[model samples]
Target: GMELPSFIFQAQENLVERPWGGEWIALLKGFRQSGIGESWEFSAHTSRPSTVLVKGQQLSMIELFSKHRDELLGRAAEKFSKFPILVRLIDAASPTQVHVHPSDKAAESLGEAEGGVESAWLVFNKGKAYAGFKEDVKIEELEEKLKEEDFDFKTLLNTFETTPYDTFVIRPGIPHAGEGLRVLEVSSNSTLAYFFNENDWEKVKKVLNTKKVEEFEVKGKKGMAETENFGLEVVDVTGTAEIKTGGVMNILYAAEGYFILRGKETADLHRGYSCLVPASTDSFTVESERGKIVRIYLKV
Candidate 1:
């Protein structure tokens, strides 16, 4: 008998979003926070405000991925990256504070503060903003300044901001953040992160235990993982440039992984269409010839 692969079903009833207050928040309230003037749709996870799902044992995405591991990796399953399944709807109503993610090795060593890289595709952004880190500032410098006064490190991090259709591949220890109207975010499944030391720093400190992030040398820390960044590429294979009404745009993010986005001209998508590629590769691609799209990936 052929060895059958595993298939995990993603529950589709879950919808989640982080709301930014004021007019933007009120505007989002009308569409029930769909924000694009329509309801946004997702394939890999279940959602309502916006779909966010985990690939449990009941979904076909997990099933096909388990069945086709060979075609996806071209190597034994053990050689591939092992991580949890993740999908999200990013609310850019307000700018997200600057932060950094550590690699698996670094996360494991810290045990308390897990870190890894992250990438995002612009789903929608009204005003220009920033993404990723601009310069390398030692964590020591951040700590010293924090003891003296409550500084707005976000200002320094914002110096390296990214515009729409722009792709920022972030590395560990790089202080970076995002500013924009709104965006659809896709990234590596891990959630652990760290921030520079400062007053009001406790707000960003999630992984810290009580006193401090257990002392560790940055020298021994692993560096950036392998990744790809395709800046503001139009999404579609049909030859159309602008995302027209009813037109579809696919977002291919992560290795050998992908998803689709159906466009709306006058209105935002309501329960719009999208596809999540079966997980097998560490990266993926989105193909649309009509509208715009973004694709990003990280090394396993």
Candidate 2:
């Protein structure tokens, strides 16, 4: 058996461009350009998997996961068909159109093909976000509203005046939207989403969760969003913090300052960049002056 290389994995994000994309990601990642909307930080989705920087060469996460599943994923290897979670920085230049994601059960029935998203948003910039209906409306009412072209669903959802470091658990099936926001989105890697503007009105109704999310505040304290697919947490490193991987691979996004991830070997993580700590390694310590880190992995 080949000895697993180092304890930490670093990736060069797949930078995605959108007309409504913002410049924050490009600016923070030190790219001298604009209109870079989404940075697929640590991903293994078939659409846009990130590339891992190992030794002196670059390897796509798709290939890496395929070849080194047991070594990289550890105890949670069976939980996913591939590397399950996606961590990205989304710079929303404009307000997002309202949308809903199917639950795994609904996804299979609705032909979501690769399943759907259960996500968490860790705020990186101050903005407004909307989630769920303010009042539970029946399917008949929602169907009637969608008949109007370019419906403004914000009036129907709960709006949050967001602040940096605040977190939200965006459970699947809730209709949600974000406006002028920058967030490090820790989500399932599937790209299946039903936007109100361009989806089967009949199929969309099948997956719409009418249940309201009344409490829309901090996923703060010890952990952030712990969904059925993955888990997220905010780790503030004031000088130093030791993070236990729990024998599951951990993907981390640095939102604040540069830090050295020290295991048996050391790997450098900088602000606005993302990396992985292999579950093969038990734990790692982050040494930093001050750092805000978002750790994403399977719930262990």
Candidate 3:
């Protein structure tokens, strides 16, 4: 619902298009390899999340979202009482650890800071990336698997790769993880993720063991087997490897979701230059016109 006036968002990192075959695909391009695990997050919600200096006052994304709640939801002032919206850029600084997020129901019982779980619009920028329901993993089997010391953890999780401008929705309970390529991640602002014993799980254990989770006071726990309870819930968008040089991809959802790709030739979007795309629009289409402009729509 909120829009960007500029093409590039300056963060505390360098944006680069990489050579492992992924290059910048939307908004601004970012590149990272091996360092930070091959991916970088453009924007994210950390208690110490990044802030921008606006009007000589520094504000985090949460503050901005609260300030513009009405315009964002296109409704009268109301309290969501649940997930908050967030936007960020992601560079697969490297492959991330396999993890899962809890459902709101579970989260509510778990703790206040940890209830909502969902990754809505994932904007890819570079390299081969991935996300989706993990393979052959069911809730009942997970509990048994957790007890095995020699379980093939990697095989239990679902894996997928992403191309620039490719969008996917990872709902709660779906055991998912992403491999890096430069990316822009637009998601719900909830931090409660369940951790599984796939990897060492030690890092996550350290936090849980120390009751640091309470200290952090955030919602969600890593290494819990809630996938079956979570089930195979995912909203998959029409994906494509059909992006062209200097092209744009407009991908969005119906519950107040939208995104645009402005191509290489155009400058920044100007007032009145933007159009109010209908929410009923589904899938992405690009007319073979002179400038590359692609628009897409989805329901929230």
Candidate 4:
């Protein structure tokens, strides 16, 4: 219906101070900051939208999408009333509090307009994390652990040692926590999280996905994973890689190294930089010495 150009974005760092934060993010940005936790590279949530630079104009991601819906999102625009995903880089220096998310149906009941968040983590380094319970846990026992100050929470859940490029799909109501790692998180556009100690046991149990993800391919020119609401694709670029939009919006984020995007216009994308490729754009080629990128898009 309308023609539009792909828009490259300047990195929007949404830094927050937390007890578990560290200097990894600060170092990445070539600066120093205390307790830096997260950098939201691409987002259009109601709470915090990322800023984008287009033709020497600065605009928030919400504004761009609102001004050119069909041109940017194509057919998916009708399915998703608004942007459907959020991407962030999380730096965890220490363990975070155990947390879980509600499912889409459960989120609606809780008055969450955007629904629940289903996320995936692309680990960048060796880390320790946990997801789901190792065995069935009674509600009473869970409650008891919640009240104790010195309880060993790991005793109840399945833990794993993370290696570089490891990928994990996190479904709603899955209990998880990350420690000593930098992760690239791609998820549904929502911000509903319940800490382990304060979550509703019945609701949590109802929404949990019990199957642990055992296999995922992260080393390839093209690899993909899918969930109910969204999908992720990893493109490892050694020299050049061409991508066709196929009339669907695409979010491209640099996962490792850097690359140059050659399309209607050329833009340099270093590690951690990102851009939104509008559906109107036919295709683009990514050229690099060596780099990796993550593509997040809506399934419907």
Q: Tell me the deviation in Å of residue 62 in model 2.
A: 1.3
lDDT of 4 by residue, 147-200 (tens): 878576655666767777777777787777788978878888887777766545
TM-score of each: 0.53, 0.91, 0.49, 0.89
- Tell me, by TM-score, which candidate is best: 2
**TM-score computed on alpha carbons, candidate 2:** 0.91
Count clashes in each candidate, considering only residues at least 3 apart in sequence or on different chains. 38, 0, 43, 0
Candidate 1, which segments miss by more than 4 Å at Cα? 1-14, 17-30, 34-78, 81-85, 112-115, 120-123, 126-141, 144-150, 158-163, 196-234, 239-273, 279-289, 293-300
lDDT per residue for candidate 3 within 70-141, as digits (tens), equals 443332124343224443444454455456566666567555564466664333344443333333334555
Write candidate 2's Cα lDDT for 80-162 as tens digits.
66668778888887888888888778888876668777887777677987888878778777767878886788778888877
Each model's lDDT comes to 0.37, 0.76, 0.36, 0.74
State in Å the error of residue 193, model 4. 0.3
For candidate 1, write residues 128-229 as lDDT tens digits: 344332344444565666776556656554343334443334444444444554444444445565655553354334322222221121111111212332
**Higher-ranked by lDDT: 1 or 4:** 4
Better of 1 and 4 by TM-score: 4
Cα displacement (angstroms), candidate 4, residue 260, comes to: 1.2
Over 4 Å off, model 4: 1-3, 198-223
